[PDB]
Amino acid sequence: TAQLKSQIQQYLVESGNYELISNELKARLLQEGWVDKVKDLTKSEMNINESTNFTQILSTVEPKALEMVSDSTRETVLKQIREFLEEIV
Amino acid sequence: TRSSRAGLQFPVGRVHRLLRKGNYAERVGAGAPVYLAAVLEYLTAEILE
Amino acid sequence: IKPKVIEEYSPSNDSWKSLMSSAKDTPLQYDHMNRESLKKYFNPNAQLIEDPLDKPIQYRVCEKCGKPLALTAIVDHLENHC
Amino acid sequence: MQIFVKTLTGKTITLEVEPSDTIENVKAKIQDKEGIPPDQQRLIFAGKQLEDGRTLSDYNIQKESTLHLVLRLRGG
Amino acid sequence: AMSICPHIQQVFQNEKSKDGVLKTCNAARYILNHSVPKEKFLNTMKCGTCHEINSGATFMCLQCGFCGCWNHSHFLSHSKQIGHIFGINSNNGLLFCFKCEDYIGNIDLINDAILAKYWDDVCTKTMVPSMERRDGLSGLINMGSTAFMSSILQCLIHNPYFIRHSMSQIHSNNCKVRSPDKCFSCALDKIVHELYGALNTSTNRQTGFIYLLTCAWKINQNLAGYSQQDAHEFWQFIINQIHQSYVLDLPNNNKQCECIVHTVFEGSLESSIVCPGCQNNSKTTIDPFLDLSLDIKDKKKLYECLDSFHKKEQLKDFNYHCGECNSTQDAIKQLGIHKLPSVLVLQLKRFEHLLNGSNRKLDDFIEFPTYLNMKNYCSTKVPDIIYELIGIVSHKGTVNEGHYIAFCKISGGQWFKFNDSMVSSISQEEVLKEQAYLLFYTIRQVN
Amino acid sequence: ITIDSISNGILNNLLTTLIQDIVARETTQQQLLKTRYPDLRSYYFDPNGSLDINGLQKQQESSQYIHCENCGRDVSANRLAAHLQRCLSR
Ligand SMILES: [Zn+2]
Ligand SMILES: [Zn+2]
Ligand SMILES: [Zn+2]
Ligand SMILES: [Zn+2]
Numbered sequence A: 001t002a003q004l005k006s007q008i009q010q011y012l013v014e015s016g017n018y019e020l021i022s023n024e025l026k027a028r029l030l031q032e033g034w035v036d037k038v039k040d041l042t043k044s045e046m047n048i049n050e051s052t053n054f055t056q057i058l059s060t061v062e063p064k065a066l067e068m069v070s071d072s073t074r075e076t077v078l079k080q081i082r083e084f085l086e087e088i089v
Numbered sequence B: 001t002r003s004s005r006a007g008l009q010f011p012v013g014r015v016h017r018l019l020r021k022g023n024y025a026e027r028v029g030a031g032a033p034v035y036l037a038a039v040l041e042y043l044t045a046e047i048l049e
Numbered sequence C: 001i002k003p004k005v006i007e008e009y010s011p012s013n014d015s016w017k018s019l020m021s022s023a024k025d026t027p028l029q030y031d032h033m034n035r036e037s038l039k040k041y042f043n044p045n046a047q048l049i050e051d052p053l054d055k056p057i058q059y060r061v062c063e064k065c066g067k068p069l070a071l072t073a074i075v076d077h078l079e080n081h082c
Numbered sequence D: 001m002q003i004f005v006k007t008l009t010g011k012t013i014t015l016e017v018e019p020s021d022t023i024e025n026v027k028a029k030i031q032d033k034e035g036i037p038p039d040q041q042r043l044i045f046a047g048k049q050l051e052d053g054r055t056l057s058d059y060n061i062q063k064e065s066t067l068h069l070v071l072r073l074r075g076g
Numbered sequence E: 001a002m003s004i005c006p007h008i009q010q011v012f013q014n015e016k017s018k019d020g021v022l023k024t025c026n027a028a029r030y031i032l033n034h035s036v037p038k039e040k041f042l043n044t045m046k047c048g049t050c051h052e053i054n055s056g057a058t059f060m061c062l063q064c065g066f067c068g069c070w071n072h073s074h075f076l077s078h079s080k081q082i083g084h085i086f087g088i089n090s091n092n093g094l095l096f097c098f099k100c101e102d103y104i105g106n107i108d109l110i111n112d113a114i115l116a117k118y119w120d121d122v123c124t125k126t127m128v129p130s131m132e133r134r135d136g137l138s139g140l141i142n143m144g145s146t147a148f149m150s151s152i153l154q155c156l157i158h159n160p161y162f163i164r165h166s167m168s169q170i171h172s173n174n175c176k177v178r179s180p181d182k183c184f185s186c187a188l189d190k191i192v193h194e195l196y197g198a199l200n201t202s203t204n205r206q207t208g209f210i211y212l213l214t215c216a217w218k219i220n221q222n223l224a225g226y227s228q229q230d231a232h233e234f235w236q237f238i239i240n241q242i243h244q245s246y247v248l249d250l251p252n253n254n255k256q257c258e259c260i261v262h263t264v265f266e267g268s269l270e271s272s273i274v275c276p277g278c279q280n281n282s283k284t285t286i287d288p289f290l291d292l293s294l295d296i297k298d299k300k301k302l303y304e305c306l307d308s309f310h311k312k313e314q315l316k317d318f319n320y321h322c323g324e325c326n327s328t329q330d331a332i333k334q335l336g337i338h339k340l341p342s343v344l345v346l347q348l349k350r351f352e353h354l355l356n357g358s359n360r361k362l363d364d365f366i367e368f369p370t371y372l373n374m375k376n377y378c379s380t381k382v383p384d385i386i387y388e389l390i391g392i393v394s395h396k397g398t399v400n401e402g403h404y405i406a407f408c409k410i411s412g413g414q415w416f417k418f419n420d421s422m423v424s425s426i427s428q429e430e431v432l433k434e435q436a437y438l439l440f441y442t443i444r445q446v447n
Numbered sequence F: 001i002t003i004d005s006i007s008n009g010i011l012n013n014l015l016t017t018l019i020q021d022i023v024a025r026e027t028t029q030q031q032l033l034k035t036r037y038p039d040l041r042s043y044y045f046d047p048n049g050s051l052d053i054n055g056l057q058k059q060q061e062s063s064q065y066i067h068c069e070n071c072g073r074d075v076s077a078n079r080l081a082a083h084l085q086r087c088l089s090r
């Protein structure tokens, strides 16, 4: 069943590890310049499409923004989540 | 110019020429015509004041 | 799902406005500056603005005296200072 | 009492002083150790520059406090 | 000519509906400012349909308690099935219209909804910032050798905490003297007034600067701009004067100062003194600081300079008797951070002393990061602690002669160069290529 | 169904959430600026490092002047401090 996901998420929230994950991810993306790259991407797309409509701009930004995420941060954060998951199953 | 480039009103060229031609030494540094043009501007200011 | 997590911890009908009560009892909070670490490593009376360059400064200018006013400062400026 | 001074390189030195000792005397001692004239010295404590004619007690400066030494970089 | 959403306009055609909306928005934002992380996750980021957290943006319903995700279109489904076209993004409080397919960011009333009750008056008495003045950008002319002042003033011109303070009218509200030719803070407020607003009712925008200069002349003529001087000394002098004016503003044994400087810039260093034998001890001294001065010699990176700053020392000239081993020892000294400031100010010690009594400038490039992690300097595990670079002061020349320039970052990520009267656009990478003398870092993330 | 897949979904959830937040903030800001300021123009950038944000060069001092309020005298600005040293000396 899919109640599992919500249950697991509830445990995750209650344990304190979510703050650590979210924060470490944010720190990595911030420090490596990815956040600002995504800001620049958003301005560029707004200028190219001559639009501030959120849905259509997002439609072009999100896939690319996802690709722009460094491999290091990806594997490190995945590694950390996996470490927290390997705890209680 | 150079009066501009030093925020001076006084002709840095004229001055560098006058320094070179009046036979005080073989070579003449770059700072001295500016420093001096400055002291000159200063004093004509104090007087006109 | 393992019985021990559920044991002491554990469409919805609940409502977010239920939080008003908590909001009533809760000190000013920041989204991504953890409070306890701020307590440990920072001073007790520090001023804090989260993401200060997110957008340009939000303020308005008095038509009468021309002062730039923070949103929380406009009203009394209008009452007895202009 | 002994106090400390963090010099330009980051090296810390120790001075022996009394609470009633003047900032001038301390600067004299620094000149005597480092060979730097008083007019070239800037002495910093608690975010403030220490001023001649005043005492250590005037700035609530106590035993084993550390002062931070800098020079002047003139511009304009 | 950007338009606004007509759907919210229709609602706004009725005053009581509008008032209900604004009241609820204000209440919601108060909740957002007064809700712990877990309640927010569980009650604003949980999809009512799939119960997933952070399935893209999660939207909080304006009319009921339902939360709906973006990725699986579940709020979108709430909108199609129940008819609620407006939802609030739980990451930023911004309101989405699913008809426009766009957020509503350009309605002043919505952006400033806390003043909604007084909005008419707010719109009659006050205007939005003028395009020209909105960022407060203006140069301060050299009135002799005043660049060491103006570059600093430009960094002061860009601090959000300071701007919040000044615009809050705190000094204005409490000043017992109320004259900018005597009060430094009044003069500052006048500067802010000139740069962001309009005095009633080419030489433009220099009045406040002239007032500041007049105060400076009155307290210490040497630092007032005729002669070349040190920007750091001026910094400490002026912040001390600001503090004195704050203290002056009291109506009435209170060692920690409660002023804007001391609630922003004051931290504390921990100095440990330990016996090399017993290695237990220690004699700990706590020293307040308003800024940090770092050695830069033989180094290429800011982290190297902080490491040197933070490096342990063995005293070879200290008279010492250990109480645990009862013997004379050469003590070990160490500096660490006890408390960090909200805004961290760094001075690079770009000078050295020679045996002949002369000094020399250090022109060495020191690499500095766009984002700075202070975690390695906290004494007591320590979580990640990251600051954002917002300011640089650079000097060109020698110890006894030169020029100061400032670099400031504003919203959107663009850098500007402040060279007396000249404000110009600059890229981040070039700022990062600058020879830094002073660096200003604002706290961004605390883990 | 595996740990790896669910983890990938969690990461995608987090990233799309953050992205949507940043983009929403950007779009709201630009919408606001353009609506508030229909005639909005970018600040001037000079590759030569000569022109200001309005595309102008550093103005000529001492061509500019200031009217000194203490004595009513106009004084060239780059000598203003000097004047004040001579003016406040009352
Ligand atoms: Zn007013
Ligand atoms: Zn609903
Ligand atoms: Zn969902
Ligand atoms: Zn709409």
Ligand SMILES: [Zn+2]
Residues within 6 Å of the ligand: E171, E175, E176, E177, E178, E179, E180, E183, E184, E185, E186
């Ligand atoms: Zn005042």
Ligand SMILES: [Zn+2]
Residues within 6 Å of the ligand: E242, E243, E244, E246, E257, E258, E259, E260, E261, E262
């Ligand atoms: Zn204070």
Ligand SMILES: [Zn+2]
Residues within 6 Å of the ligand: E275, E276, E277, E278, E279, E322, E323, E324, E325, E326, E327
């Ligand atoms: Zn011992």
Ligand SMILES: [Zn+2]
Residues within 6 Å of the ligand: F068, F069, F070, F071, F072, F073, F087
């Ligand atoms: Zn006058």
